[PDB]
């Protein structure tokens, strides 16, 4: 608070770095101006991380396997390479699904080619071919396979496209080779892009010349909702109560047939712009399908989204929209009446991935809370363009923040609440600052939609006002 003072804090924190890192990090920290429309004038993003500074970022494999492909429930996803990557990512993300796991669905499982030294030296294409035969033997109801490359696959030049084509034809199966070796790009983000392109090239066009699906004018798809703790379900219920038909959700609780049917819809509803804008633009260019961003975090944004979406159709849908909004009005008003008095005026700092750092702000504001700092691991400048108008003047923005920076900023701004990831959580709890996981929802949720808002409000209150936070100082000190 106060622009000169925030700029002072930034320069103080930067003093610890060597010149090269100091010069770089300076470009990734900003004091917000809601007026500014071109964030390139104010902050730089989507650049390589400085070595040794404890970035919070992950890799392209996390962005491809962990985020986009992993949730698709009736396919089997191969972590191709050594045993590490697939094991750390096994069931760490709560992309919820309905299925019979190990039989027709496979999301929580870890399939891997478990590369050994002889596989590196002699290459793994023969092992991958045999692995695919064994998958078909032991999991006959799988509806397709993806091959998610880890680092060594990309270095040694294994030809996984050729293997996917030959085995695909031999077994009449969709097999999707993904070059998401983790050293590509600079973060999870290039993994999104690589994964989108793999969907485009290997899956999405499968029904291009099939007309057996009966489409309606109210057909939509939810693009970029990974159903964390059931988020997509509590969004999908609203769209369908509004009279729309949700043919697909990408990719939380998603199925390969939903993906193949998606080119038949009338409108693509994009929640996560960062991870799925690529295939959204593709679908408009090839199929003529328009897309629109929406936001189902909190009642103000949900209501605004529902009306914006409904205006895209006809009067019948707009009538149903207002009827949905009327139905849920006393529910979220009771949530606000109960929890807003407990949270009013509290100040929050966020640090998340590529969407939620701006997207959840409205929900905090519906509870009378103030977001005084936000930032992203891997957003691009078109994300910051959308962020600066959502944030207050002289709030702090930080891109690819370091462990050191984030801590120093928190010590000076002294938020009442911090919303970030598992690698941040236990640091700030020890400083006595209430912390909410804003990736995993701290094993709670959903937070999307009206039903989600009630849980979000409950969770923020339970943590911010918990009796544990008064107990950190021993009485004799």
């Amino acid at each position: 608070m106060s622009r000169e003072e925030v700029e002072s804090l930034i320069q103080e924190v930067l003093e610890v770095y060597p010149e090269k890192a100091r010069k770089d990090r300076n470009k990734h920290l900003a004091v917000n101006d809601p007026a500014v429309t071109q964030s390139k004038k104010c902050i730089i993003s989507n650049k390589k991380s400085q070595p040794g500074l404890m970035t919070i970022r992950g890799c392209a494999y996390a962005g491809s396997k962990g985020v986009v492909w992993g949730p698709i429930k009736d396919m089997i996803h191969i972590s191709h390479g050594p045993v590490g990557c697939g094991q750390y990512s096994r069931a760490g993300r709560r992309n919820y699904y309905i299925g019979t796991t190990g039989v027709n669905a496979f999301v929580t499982m870890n399939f891997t080619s478990d590369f050994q030294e002889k596989d590196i030296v002699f290459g793994g294409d023969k092992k991958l071919a045999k692995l695919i035969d064994e998958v078909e033997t032991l999991f006959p109801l799988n509806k397709g396979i993806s091959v998610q490359s880890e680092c060594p696959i990309g270095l040694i030049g294994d030809d996984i496209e050729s293997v996917s084509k030959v085995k695909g034809a031999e077994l009449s199966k969709t097999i999707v080779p993904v070059r998401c070796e983790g050293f590509r790009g600079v973060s999870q983000s290039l993994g999104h892009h690589i994964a989108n392109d793999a969907v485009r090239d290997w899956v999405l066009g499968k029904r291009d010349e099939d007309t057996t699906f009966a489409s309606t004018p109210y057909d939509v798809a939810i693009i970029g909702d990974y159903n964390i703790g059931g988020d997509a379900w509590s969004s999908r219920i609203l769209l369908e109560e509004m009279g729309l038909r949700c043919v697909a959700q990408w990719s939380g609780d998603g199925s390969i047939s939903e993906i193949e049917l998606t080119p038949k819809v009338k409108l693509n509803l994009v929640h996560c712009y960062r991870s799925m804008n690529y295939i959204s633009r593709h679908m408009e260019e090839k199929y003529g399908i328009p897309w629109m961003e929406y936001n189902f975090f909190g009642p103000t944004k949900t209501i605004e989204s529902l009306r914006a979406i409904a205006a895209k159709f006809d009067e019948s849908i707009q009538k149903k929209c207002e009827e949905v909004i009327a139905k849920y009005k006393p529910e979220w008003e009771a949530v606000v009446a109960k929890y807003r008095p407990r949270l009013e005026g509290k100040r929050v700092m966020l640090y998340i991935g590529g969407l939620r750092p701006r997207h959840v702000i409205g929900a905090y504001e519906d509870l009378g809370m103030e977001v005084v700092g936000t930032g992203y691991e891997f957003a691009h400048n078109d994300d910051y363009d959308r962020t600066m108008k959502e944030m207050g003047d002289s709030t702090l923005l930080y891109d690819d923040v370091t462990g050191y920076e984030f801590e120093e900023f928190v010590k000076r701004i002294k938020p009442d609440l911090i919303g970030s990831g598992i690698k941040e959580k236990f640091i700030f709890q020890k400083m006595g600052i209430p912390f909410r996981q804003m990736h995993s929802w701290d094993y709670s949720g959903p937070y999307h939609g009206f039903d989600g808002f009630a849980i979000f409000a409950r969770d923020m209150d339970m943590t911010l006002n918990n009796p544990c936070w008064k107990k950190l100082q021993a009485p004799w000190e």
Binding site: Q116, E117, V121, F122, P152
Partner: protein, 271 residues
């Protein structure tokens, strides 16, 4: 006081032949020597063994599943003069990662105590295309302390010398590996000896020996032998004994000062 030595140089310049003929001569003198092939085509010991099949570390590992299941006496063999021979091995061309094969094989040798026993010399025979970190495994700390670069009076072969010296510098500055000299494997070019002596001084090393072009080297090779074994009294055999003697008594170990591709062009015009 075992001396570890690594042989580098332009592809096709005569590294493997020179190394094996050198080693035969050392063994003829009574030196105990091990040759480590660091090339996936595994042809570094072909002329020393030439009797019975050679199995490579990587091939034997694949058959056994991992390197941990491998035993040293399965891959380490003795040939002419009791010279001990072992090959890294690696994939056929165009697949896998031969660089990692060399890393793995030398790690194995280290772990299994190959460098115990009282050897006077170890030579690493490396391929010409040093395209990654793995092929510089032989010049890491605790490996080769002396590099000999095989060259000739041909442009490509001097540019290779210089460029290899470039690559050597990061290891030389950080450890004890040093350039021991240039070995001129002659291509019968005009005033070749003077010219290589000249390149040596710009780099800061020496031309330790001039090896004549002699087709007996190729006749021995066709019979899978060194000249020392094939024709112990040939002129060329005496050349290799001469080379071996210099290597035994050599104390000149320096850090290379590579020159510009311009200085090299200067050298070749001025001759």
């Amino acid at each position: 006081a075992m001396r570890q030595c690594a042989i580098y140089g332009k592809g096709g310049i005569g590294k493997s032949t020179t190394t094996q003929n050198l080693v035969a001569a050392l063994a003829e003198m009574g030196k105990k020597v091990m040759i480590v092939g660091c090339d996936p085509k595994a042809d570094s010991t072909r002329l020393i063994l030439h009797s019975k099949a050679q199995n490579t570390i990587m091939e034997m590992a694949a058959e056994a599943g991992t390197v941990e299941d491998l035993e040293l006496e399965d891959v380490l063999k003795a040939g002419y003069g009791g010279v001990k021979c072992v090959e890294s091995g690696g994939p056929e061309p165009g697949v896998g990662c031969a660089g990692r094969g060399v890393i793995t094989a030398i790690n194995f040798l280290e772990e299994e105590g190959a460098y115990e026993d009282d050897l006077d010399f170890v030579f690493y025979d490396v391929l010409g295309d040093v395209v990654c970190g793995g092929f510089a495994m032989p010049i890491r700390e605790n490996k080769a302390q002396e590099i000999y670069i095989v060259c000739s009076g041909e442009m490509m072969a001097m540019y290779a010398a210089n460029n290899i010296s470039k690559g050597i510098v990061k290891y030389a500055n950080s450890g004890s590996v040093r350039l021991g000299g240039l070995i001129c494997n002659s291509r019968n070019t005009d005033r070749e000896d003077e010219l290589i002596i000249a390149l040596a001084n710009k780099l800061g090393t020496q031309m330790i020996h001039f090896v004549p072009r002699d087709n007996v080297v190729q006749r021995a090779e066709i019979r899978r032998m060194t000249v020392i074994e094939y024709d112990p009294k040939a002129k060329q055999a005496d050349e290799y004994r001469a080379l071996a003697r210099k290597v035994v008594d050599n104390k000149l170990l320096v850090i290379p000062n590579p020159i510009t591709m311009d200085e090299l062009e200067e050298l070749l015009m001025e001759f």
